[PDB]
Design a protein around this ligand. Structure first.
Ligand SMILES: [Mn+2]
Lengths: 128, 68
């Protein structure tokens, strides 16, 4: 994929956001921004230019599933790739993510190699 | 009692898909071929949900469900 692809990392925990930003750096993607919850993320996504969203599940104000569903129901950004991050491989969340249109999911904590495999599958599916 | 069969799987996908299915339900009589995976599903999840989750990795035409 284009190494200048613009990523939005959404998570209410600063450490976790920084960890994801740094793993993406390890994989060669340095054009990354951060958001603290679904509200902040939607506001930033309106600014435009984003090409990929990695969003945590549990956040205050607006959680990850709600953000995903809101993205999917929008006009302009409806097809944006969205990788959901979850704390456990819980069946109802994995099913809910899939049925809501997530591009994939990944369980934290995850490594650079796991992140890379997840991103490649998505790139493959969307032809990136 | 229903059977699931996954075909034309790539390197590492037999194990990966076994693990993905295992988060969703409890498989029995699991057969891991070199590029295929079959198993018996307890029937505790709709097949449309299994499909949607598995499609994160493969294509829908690679999945078949049948009565054993
Ligand atoms: Mn969180």
């Amino acid at each position: 994929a284009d190494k200048e692809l613009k990523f939005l990392v959404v998570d209410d925990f600063s450490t976790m956001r920084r960890i994801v930003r740094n793993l993406l750096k390890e994989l060669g993607f340095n054009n990354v921004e951060e958001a603290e919850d679904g509200v902040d993320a939607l506001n930033k996504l309106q600014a435009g230019g984003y090409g990929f969203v990695i969003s945590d599940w549990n956040m205050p104000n607006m959680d990850g599933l709600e953000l995903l569903k809101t993205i999917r129901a929008d006009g302009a950004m409806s097809a944006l790739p969205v990788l959901m991050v979850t704390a456990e491989a819980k069946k109802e969340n994995i099913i809910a993510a899939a049925q809501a249109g997530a591009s994939g999911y990944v369980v934290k904590p995850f490594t650079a190699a796991t992140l890379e495999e997840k991103l490649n599958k998505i790139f493959e599916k969307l032809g990136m | 009692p229903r059977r699931i069969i996954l075909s034309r799987l790539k390197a590492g996908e037999v194990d990966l898909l076994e693990e993905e299915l295992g988060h969703l339900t409890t498989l029995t009589d699991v057969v891991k071929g070199a590029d295929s995976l079959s198993a018996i599903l307890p029937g505790d999840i709709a097949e449309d949900d299994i499909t949607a989750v598995l499609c994160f990795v493969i294509e829908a035409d690679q999945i078949t469900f049948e009565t054993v």
